[PDB]
Design a protein around this ligand. Structure first.
Ligand SMILES: Nc1ncnc2c1ncn2[C@@H]1O[C@H](CO)[C@@H](O)[C@H]1O
Ligand SMILES: Nc1ncnc2c1ncn2[C@@H]1O[C@H](CO)[C@@H](O)[C@H]1O
Ligand SMILES: Nc1ncnc2c1ncn2[C@@H]1O[C@H](CO)[C@@H](O)[C@H]1O
Ligand SMILES: Nc1ncnc2c1ncn2[C@@H]1O[C@H](CO)[C@@H](O)[C@H]1O
Ligand SMILES: Nc1ncnc2c1ncn2[C@@H]1O[C@H](CO)[C@@H](O)[C@H]1O
Ligand SMILES: Nc1ncnc2c1ncn2[C@@H]1O[C@H](CO)[C@@H](O)[C@H]1O
Ligand code: MET
Ligand code: MET
Ligand code: MET
Ligand code: MET
Ligand code: MET
Ligand code: MET
Lengths: 285, 285, 285, 292, 292, 292
């Protein structure tokens, strides 16, 4: 039962995604295509990375991840196809253990896989050039279809990964550089990485382990200032309801393990026009 | 061929729904996940109820409905899993008769299933606590995944419903209270329950049976006033085209059996900024 | 492995599409429903046509296309079901050749299939009236479900096309009339047919063959004026990156073969409030 | 104590109006410049016309009206300056303005000066005029006018000379009536028990709705105070109310009121609430009026 | 050289204000009409009140304040005209306005005329008054007032007669204090180290935030210049800053400042940046003040 | 008949401007306060500068310009008051304003008073000045200025004393030229057949586009009336048109026009249509000009 999990910037308003799915079913009969999302901000490689970095442990072994925003479409660039190592457990009971090397990502070689590779490691990476799995005459503006969707379907059908093209050195895989959290005492500086739609919760790049280094744990009183102006105060709690009344401010670690801000069953970011990229300062005593 | 029909407030812009689907396929290989919608207004239990109340007759028997907006995520609350009684026919010819007790809903116990239970009745309801079908260590902020998606997949795989947890008394199932239509002569008062996106038609809580009690039938001339200010007049007709010219006002019973307002092949609500919650007054003579 | 590719104006915010899919699975067990899109501008038959005209070559033979915007819902009108001739190749290598007569469209008879029929031709067309494949008592406002979704599933299950109703003459199939490109020297006049969401690229009705007639080929310097006011200049290039710096203007043939405008990895239409329908004038020397 | 009442499309965000006023004071020391408004939709002469046609009876005799939207600035066109005949009564009833029984205004006692582009159409129609002149004399306009600023050069500057007592007939040659540009207004159509017209304006900042159906139109149709009416907008919104003097007659806050506005025309509104703004109702919607 | 200071809800987009001014000049030749503002939210008497309560000390004695939002226009209601007692000192400190030590204003030297609908509540509260009269004499209002335009008929027109020297006591009968409509304002609540109040206004066009906590409230709570404060908005935004004279005392551009505004009330802002606009902060948010 | 021309960032929605005017009349009875505009973007001194630099030639000699955006209000800063030298000619051609050949203005005949924060940069640059003084005397400012309201305390109030004839040199000590704060403006870059600059302003309410390329810049580049030009905005929109006197020279309504604006700078627009608004074109876009 092959599965392709599909994340793109192709949108939800025309036939772009369906063209890809038709070909996926053409190449791999009985494939199941699971949509991640197709509404990421176009060409925002760091935003796309967030939508795909923690997928593996949720999916059956052998799942292929087709992940793409392709602003360099039509150029001599070629996609990269990678077998990751550690799935890094979700599910009922104690969850579902996944064996190493059980997932393949295929994407533009433009940094999209940066955090996937950082968190999971990888066993082998190849550039995708073989006309066995890509068109001999690719549509210049549609590499998300030609260089990702189509070869992802061959990989799901069991095309041997090592035959898609030559093996890449680690230096040939493009990566983006994320801003580091800055820690001084129990005072941390970071950024808003995302507005958690559709709730308007606010996600930061400050991880649980950053909090731990600052001696911040559950129940610690925090002050969080956004963009050096807008202040919030709350204890660190497991979840939204811990803020008490509807509308109250909660500080919590999100399901990804990162410090987040929210109103309890109300939207925090939207009424204040808050967006990703704002500076975050965290203070505890 | 097991089917899970999935309705959530999780949105369409990140990997939340895909995490659920991966696990559903992990737990129930060969399951088909049919998306209802994932864009309901967060925490609006009455809006969610509308999207799920009339699903059963459309689906093959044995379908599991995973339906969730979970503002109490992370608390000691537990989901409820319910086998409904009457499917309450759709399809070609005279439609498809569905046997009693053929569908299971699983949802937060927060009133989401209120109208499902009212229209279909139910045979048996259980709280979902067994670590055979939920995580032993659930992600606090993600009960829509942990307490709905994951156990819905076990139920679809044939996990016995009565083993998910203890059986609930009817008093333990939370319900919301809907405002009643008020009837005086052939004058009715109700509310706008929904803007019918993407058309901008206007749906009210005034049912066919309310109209019947007021002696209002097909062709009756009506005056409908919204929010005690904005007036419309038309005869009650079966459909949009019966208004005549494009843009003309039609009054009709929607596919759910409720009195609705529309412009013929044009949007009524959007140009006038009309939204759910407005008072509705209906007058006939 | 039957496939229905589903394009509608039913939206993504309620249970409308799921009601259709439930019935499709009810009628054709093991069917795969592939969503094209459901967010087309309601009742815009020319916009819908664009989303479905080039689908066939992407899909396995035997695929049924269920395509619908149905403003005449509830009237005596009946859908048309058509076996097209030429699929008109996509895929790896030299692509996937599709045999003639391998696809069926079913749609309102309201012009939606106009360009499908123009580009592919057709072998046979029927009105859909048999209560073997439509309801004996159709919901007046829901013909997209009753007259398209339901019979599309019977066709996918192998219901013989010629038995859905009587065979239509070509004169009985409604068509819309598209505005023609006007060519004078190497000066062309057309219109913006679409904003290419989510990128904000601008698509025109000026085809590669129109450019060829004007002696315009790759590298030719063009001036394009929108709405007789807003000017742009660039050489014709294969793709976005050929504009050079991020934000620079590119002129290119889109994946459909039509002259298009874009900023390189930035949105052209949105900052300038540009929308479909604007006049397009093209000048070369 | 001369007065220039100044209506333009120059806006309120830069020094354009002040340049005009500086010059008005330079030419007519002691002048008072009374702003009408400066926010009209640029180049909409029919909107501009509504802001100036009712002014004369409110002002002291001798007042000069400098009124201008000038899209033909810098061309060979020249402004028209005109002495009107009747100051004219106005309002829901038709009366002189002021305390007591109001202030009767003498004939021939106001001058309008404007681009000759139709801006004065309803001024001339409602007030009549004695003689009209094109404005060409370099005694009252620049010898070398700023091409893009005729609202200053050909309206503000000569209006101040006129306010200072410069003889109107010496601004340039007399115009024939046929040389005066006019726009054409939609007529009200009248059946016995009914009337059709149009929304002419949203009454800012309240959101009241003004139509072109005049008191005299109502009278011809046998409609007077207290008459139960239906007023349908856009053939889709059938409002019902009696014709009343004012908003509060509708009773509760928010209730629909039908009334003659302060210009003498049938209008709709909500009592101390905005009718047009919540529902995006705008000028140009068709109006049907029916006696019930 | 009489002055009428004119505050209305008539807006700045049509000829309504000019009609009023034309009549003011007709009645009081030589008058100067000083616009206060005309953009107040229609029918919001508490907002209108804030625009007029601090005016007297800024104007020459004899100045008449014509202040009006008139949703009851055209009813049997009549305007109130009143001679106030104390011009009153104001500001962050409480002083006379002007150069040097400021200009002391004599008592009984300003008249307000307004709809009797509560608009003058804080004027009367802060200044006191000698006598109040309903405005009924057709010496100073029309015999047949335009029903929808009492702001012109019952405020503008009589204000000009008063400016011209018409005796206040002859405008109509004396009112008892109980006949003067008043609105009720939220009181500041005071604990020893803390205070609760409300945002009364966003200070346009800067986006500063004004509260109802007055200097005298701070003094009662032992809070003076330099005191470290917390000001929490909407029980969700806990701003912290010392109380300072002005914006630049916050240091860097964009930093939060707490200060007494020019009306004497505790306010919050950013130094040469907008506080309220980027975050959609609006009047009505709860305020909690704490000494730190 | 003294005049104060008043430009501020105080806005048009509350009583701030009226407080200033009340005081101006208190100090200079008989003064006329001519509003320039009050809607400038707060604290944008370069925008404020554009609203005041062209004023002098339009006003009678002796006119005082009170011009203020004051983000440093309440600090030790003091306003600068200055007698300018040349009133200066202006416009597309460079001429005196007014009828006939215009009104020549004497030197040394206007005073500007402003925060010393660069607001007067282009005023001083284009007009020159005789002497500049810091404003400190309590004869003309309050002994105890309202900390947040220096636009009133340190500009409005002393401007009225100056209008009343108070000797400029007695407002405080003479400043050295180096003590006058200035902002720095982008220079136009000139190649033989081409020029680069910037959009300085959108011309509201029309949506015309103003650049910093001056008539004298065009002359240096050999560009005169009728010259076929290309003007590229943001290196993405290559407009083409001949240089013409005015908008209507473009022919049909909506056609692109290139012209020298009333301030003397190269501008782009559509003939009786808005260029900038439909496409969200704003100040700050780069400009390239090419002779064709
Ligand atoms: N204007 C554009 N500039 C650069 N890349 C684009 C543009 N429009 C679409 N694309 C890219 O083309 C890809 C499809 O091949 C999409 O994933 C998208 O990132
Ligand atoms: N700010 C919030 N307050 C309460 N519940 C939330 C919030 N954000 C997301 N959730 C809920 O968490 C659920 C996922 O477990 C979603 O269904 C959603 O209802
Ligand atoms: N107001 C309306 N007027 C005409 N058709 C409509 C309207 N609302 C929905 N529909 C149509 O009903 C169809 C469903 O049967 C949709 O495809 C849609 O086109
Ligand atoms: N782009 C434009 N096209 C035509 N006329 C204009 C334009 N911009 C301003 N004007 C006109 O110039 C006049 C000033 O002379 C204004 O009254 C205005 O109507
Ligand atoms: N729709 C309305 N309802 C009540 N009062 C109104 C309305 N429109 C304008 N007014 C009032 O009429 C006054 C003029 O007499 C204005 O001050 C204003 O407050
Ligand atoms: N938040 C603020 N920061 C700095 N200056 C301000 C602020 N609000 C108003 N001002 C200034 O105060 C002046 C009045 O003294 C105004 O001209 C204005 O520029
Ligand atoms: C991504 S834009 C170019 C590729 C294709 N035409 C599409 O719209 O998806
Ligand atoms: C619903 S918010 C918390 C759960 C998860 N992080 C999500 O975004 O869906
Ligand atoms: C398309 S509107 C009428 C059909 C159905 N009620 C729906 O909302 O889709
Ligand atoms: C309307 S163009 C003439 C006015 C002047 N050019 C300005 O706006 O500054
Ligand atoms: C506020 S209604 C009175 C004013 C007048 N009717 C107008 O707006 O023209
Ligand atoms: C710009 S702050 C000084 C003005 C005054 N505080 C006001 O806005 O009322």
């Amino acid at each position: 039962r092959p599965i392709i999990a599909f994340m793109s910037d192709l949108g939800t308003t025309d036939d772009s995604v369906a063209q890809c799915k038709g070909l996926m079913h053409s190449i791999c009969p009985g494939v199941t295509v699971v949509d991640v999302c197709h509404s990421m901000t176009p060409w925002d490689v760091e935003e796309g990375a967030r939508y795909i970095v923690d997928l593996p442990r949720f999916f059956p072994e052998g799942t292929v991840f087709a992940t793409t925003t392709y602003p360099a479409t039509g150029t001599t660039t070629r996609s990269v196809a990678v077998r990751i190592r550690q799935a890094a457990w979700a599910g009922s009971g104690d969850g579902f253990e996944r064996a190493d090397g059980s997932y393949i990502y295929i994407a533009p070689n433009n940094g999209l896989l940066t955090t996937v590779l950082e968190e999971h490691g990888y066993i082998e990476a190849y550039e995708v050039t073989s006309t066995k799995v890509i068109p001999a005459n690719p549509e210049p503006t549609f590499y998300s279809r030609e260089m990702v969707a189509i070869p992802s379907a061959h990989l799901a059908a069991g095309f041997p990964l090592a035959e898609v093209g030559r093996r890449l050195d680690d230096s040939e895989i493009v990566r983006f550089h994320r801003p580091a959290v800055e820690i001084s005492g129990e005072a941390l500086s970071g950024v808003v990485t995302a507005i958690d739609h559709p709730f308007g919760n606010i996600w930061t790049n400050i991880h649980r382990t950053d909090l731990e280094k600052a001696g911040i744990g559950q129940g610690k009183h925090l002050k969080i200032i956004l963009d050096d102006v807008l202040p919030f105060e709350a204890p660190l709690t497991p979840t939204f309801a811990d803020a008490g009344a509807i509308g109250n401010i909660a500080f919590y670690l999100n399901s990804r393990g990162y410090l987040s801000l929210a109103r309890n069953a109300a939207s925090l970011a939207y009424p204040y026009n808050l967006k990703a990229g704002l500076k975050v300062r965290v203070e505890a005593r």
